[PDB]
Amino acid sequence: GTKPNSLVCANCEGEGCVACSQCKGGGVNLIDHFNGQFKAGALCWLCRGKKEVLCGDCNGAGFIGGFLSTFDE
Amino acid sequence: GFKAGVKDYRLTYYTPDYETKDTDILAAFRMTPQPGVPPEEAGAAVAAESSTGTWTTVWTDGLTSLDRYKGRCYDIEPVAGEENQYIAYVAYPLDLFEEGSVTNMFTSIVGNVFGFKALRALRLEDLRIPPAYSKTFQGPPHGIQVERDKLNKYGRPLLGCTIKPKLGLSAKNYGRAVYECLRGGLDFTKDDENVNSQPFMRWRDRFLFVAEAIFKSQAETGEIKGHYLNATAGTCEEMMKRAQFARELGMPIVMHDYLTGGFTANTTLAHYCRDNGLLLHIHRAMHAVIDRQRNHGIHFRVLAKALRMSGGDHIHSGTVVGKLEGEREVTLGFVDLLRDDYIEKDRSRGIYFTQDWVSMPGVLPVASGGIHVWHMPALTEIFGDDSVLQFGGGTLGHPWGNAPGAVANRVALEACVQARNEGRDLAREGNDIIREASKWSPELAAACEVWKEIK
Amino acid sequence: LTYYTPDYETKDTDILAAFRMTPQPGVPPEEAGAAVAAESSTGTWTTVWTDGSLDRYKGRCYDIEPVAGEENQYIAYVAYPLDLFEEGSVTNMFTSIVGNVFGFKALRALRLEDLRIPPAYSKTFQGPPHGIQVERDKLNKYGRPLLGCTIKPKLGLSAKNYGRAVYECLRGGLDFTKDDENVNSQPFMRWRDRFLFVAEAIFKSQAETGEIKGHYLNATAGTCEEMMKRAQFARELGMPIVMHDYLTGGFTANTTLAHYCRDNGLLLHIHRAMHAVIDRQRNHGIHFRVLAKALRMSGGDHIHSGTVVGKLEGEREVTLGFVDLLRDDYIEKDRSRGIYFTQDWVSMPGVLPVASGGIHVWHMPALTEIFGDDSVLQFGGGTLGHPWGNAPGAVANRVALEACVQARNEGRDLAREGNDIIREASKWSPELAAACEVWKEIKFVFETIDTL
Amino acid sequence: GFKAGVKDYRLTYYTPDYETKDTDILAAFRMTPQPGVPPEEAGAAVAAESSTGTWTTVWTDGLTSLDRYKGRCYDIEPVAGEENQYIAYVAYPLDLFEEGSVTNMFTSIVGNVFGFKALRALRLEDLRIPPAYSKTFQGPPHGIQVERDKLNKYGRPLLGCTIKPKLGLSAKNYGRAVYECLRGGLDFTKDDENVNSQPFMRWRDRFLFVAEAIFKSQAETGEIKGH
Amino acid sequence: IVGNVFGFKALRALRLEDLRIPPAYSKTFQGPPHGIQVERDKLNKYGRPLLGCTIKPKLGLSAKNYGRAVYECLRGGLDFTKDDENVNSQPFMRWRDRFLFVAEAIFKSQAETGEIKGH
Amino acid sequence: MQVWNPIDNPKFETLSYLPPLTDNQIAREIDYMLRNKWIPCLEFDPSGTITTLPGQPGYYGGRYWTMWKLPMFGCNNAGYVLREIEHCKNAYPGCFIRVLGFDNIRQVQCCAFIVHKP
């Protein structure tokens, strides 16, 4: 998950936070998610009004190798 | 008679045919000498300047009788592939060590031989401790079974989390986060190795707030909870004071650093913990400066044995899932060296000598470093239900807060254990079982959207 | 871009460090330095976790240089704020700077070379118990280097026999004697009898010649209580000096002992054991110039510095540089000896260096040139291996040193004309003649592995 | 090398052109000398009899090397309006003080200079402490933020009251008034500086009664109270 | 007695001059440790005033040098010697070494003249 | 082999193992001292015994001597020092005599040796 010859997370592209998909830039449910547990109007069921999410690869680091993105051993 | 002058080493310290005794200590280094010296001289030289030898013949030796006190090289084996590498084997009498001291053994076996102008590199690999030198130590304070009885938790691995990048915080904000995480459903909660006492936060009030949070979190759930408190300091009077206060508040566990603090303080702390009924957690810092390179240093499997005899209950061991075949065999071997009671010889797993522990308790291994929900079944199937799993950014990164973050991990672990207890294979099914459990827990979902599958 | 500030104006209360790095193929250099700084301070380049004021708790890279002669080697400079460290604790400092950066998988090797400690942080430590001037005033010895000897064989001798050798050695003309580092308490000899016999020998030897003598008593133990018990007895008997190993024992125990020695008026001698496991390769580990500074901060009076003509590795220039960082008060920057930063010790006492490890009479002229008259020289096998005995062996060692001291003061060279100084002195000394005949052609020359 | 006799002070303790360092302690007195003495001599005399100096030249000084240890007057400014008033400025090396002791600094800076028969008045105005002498002290026990966290009170100033002239009162009457005031709604309650232990009231029973009152006042309101 | 009367504005200045302490209040104090007669009896000196001297320069000397001056001063005929009031414990001289050197000088000086000395 | 005599063999620290010193040797060190800008001084005493105490580390008796006149500050020729020695020898003919040196920058002595014996 690094750019050509550069320890930088390709997804967040050096940011740590990505965009919400459920609302896709909106912060409002576009359907009734789950089953009667979510409606189509209130805040997104995930970001809950933020359009933001931590990057899965780099847990907010921006780079790869480290005590937050790598295993251990 | 006395003959003043200099002689060779292979004339009194190389014993090709020698039969070892049961009360002996054995070692095994790999060496690479300088151009000019024959391997035999090198090996003999190593043993000579580590037991009883100099460089020019002394007279006070004809009144002590050697042969009874002296180390001996009794075998040399070439290494395949390399052109200038060999494995040596030295034997040490038992009347040369002081009982109950790790410092003496370490300063005798490796003290000044790693810096001679006749070698270019050295590395220690394994050691064999006779069952007559071990019975003089105390060992771990409690062990494995006693700790489980004390905590009243059976059948599954324990869970924990660490306060990740969150420094410069006041004590109250620290306690609030600790309470939230503990109420979430976890068991343990760590601290940060680089946090002892600083201008932005002193130690007494942090202890007070953590102790206040633990009880109030414990009341609502009816389960035993704890938190590791760092006790590393600059002198021996501060460390004892912090341990005594921690006991006074009625906390169940403390934590120490043993590579940068020393063996003497670690032994003193272990004795106190055994005397007063506490648990000890051991963290390994700066270890990578020694055991990383392949042709110089000391392997970690020796430091593990040293830690077992000095005393401890938990120890870090690193993850093993991202290890390819061939490797991870060493890790599985030196985990067995930590948990079992009788280990046989196996060269494919990096074991050089057969080891007997004559009824000494075990040590729980700890795994950590970037892990999420999708790694649950693999870790459950590799280690078994005798370990501690520590989560970092996989708990504080949830988009809904700290408390819902622990519920997902708890649900995933329970689902994996239930699946294992039914006959289903935890290696092939894998990604499939998590999805089914996600279809009745809104908190497991949302988490399975930030962290993707394996493959 | 962030953890790399190519303009930051370093303050005067910051701690600076310099690493040498070996990146993997492809990784750009100015990207690895930033990673080293982040993975040492916080572990991030983004602000996703802050917004809770931070920044005032992060390290930053501010310079990068290429190493001349090697195509893959660089030097990185990092600065740390003052509020990250606890006052009066070396354990913390070592844990905070080095404790996670040596496992980074984007690099292949790493070595710490130098560190700069500001005066605002040095004033919170105690330092050496006595120093250099106070010890010389106490012992009443001026104008020449001191002499000493270690006892052999190591492990195997009893207590009566151990004491019978100290007397004969001490009665011959030496000033000090020492126990091997691996001698604490063993089945063949326990400590409380060795102490008594050594004390009796010291008194008997002192009454004879008419000068002050001493012996370094080992106090390393497996627990703190035993270590503190073994020093109160030495205080009771009136002995002047003790010894301790600070790398296999610990920094926490060394600091507790230094405090006790300052409180009760004793002298401390330090031994550097196991150090070769950390500083021998020229591309991984920590240099000794850093451990020497740490010990000077923690507390001690003597320290082993190594020879340059013995059986163990060591290079002239490098040595000449760290002997001043250990003895002097203000040191400027010189990269031809290995100094990367300037150092000010704001009035803190100095530490005596010691040289030992396979040396004899045909080495006095050089040792006297490399070190001034502010050091201690030790000879174990060079004394107990004389064809006659221990007293005849000690006399030969003192005469050589006296002749060398007189020559220099008369204004003659020592490098050019040294064998003559020894040959001329051997004419009137029947003991020096025997020694010269035994060890005439015995030297140690091999290729250095830690060139520079 | 030694010349027995008396000399002037402005010959070794007045350094018009001196650049101060970052590890120095600085002071500032205002002075008014006696008719006869030039201001320079006066200023130099203060610096001398406060660091290292006497009145008749001693020989044991050619073995210690001064210049490293010595105070120095490096500026004098006249006070407008007044006819015989001036401001002086003295610098003190850092190796002259003991770490962690306020008594030593106070006894060194002002010990015997306020009583020389060549001045008529003196007054100290300010001091500059380098950041290398302060790091050896401990400072306040807790501070500001920690105390507010301990008491759990934010946003407004705290309130308190002091027992007015009600001396010759028994312990029980003292505790009753303390309880009434605390239940009223205040936060703190003081004592009286001139009350330690007297025949009409000893200290142990007063402590006991105050402690008894604090808890019972605290129970009814659910707020932290003290005395 | 004095802790608030020196800020009264209705006045311009104030100075305390004397006090009288009744015997019913003085008996609760201990007083001087020994006094005048006991000290003279202890030191065995009667007939004339005593003599003394302070050491200079103040701040700057080592411990060996400090002790070398006490002996020469004490061996000449004086009775007592004193440390400056600002001499406590400083980077240039600690106290535990000063005490030992002073004791040695005192013993050596006492053995020569034949009279009791102190510091 | 030979045996070192243990009976009645006192030593006097530096330069006591080398053959006896001559006046040329003496007026050779005084010059070495002067070339480095150090201050000479003389001391005398009638005995050289050393005494200890029961339980006090670092305490010995017999370390202080008596100073001749005062340290020779501002001295640039050796001759003067040699004359002062003859005066001291004439004054007290039953005592030891020592020569010292001093460094005011590090505050410490630099050399010491004996020049007369009873």
Ligand SMILES: O=C(O)[C@@](O)(COP(=O)(O)O)[C@H](O)[C@H](O)COP(=O)(O)O
């Ligand atoms: O144990 C020894 O070998 C020595 O006593 C030397 O003995 P000989 O002189 O009798 O050989 C010293 O401890 C070493 O020099 C230590 O080395 P370093 O100074 O590098 O710590």
Ligand SMILES: [Mg+2]
């Ligand atoms: Mg040795």
Ligand SMILES: [Mg+2]
């Ligand atoms: Mg005075």
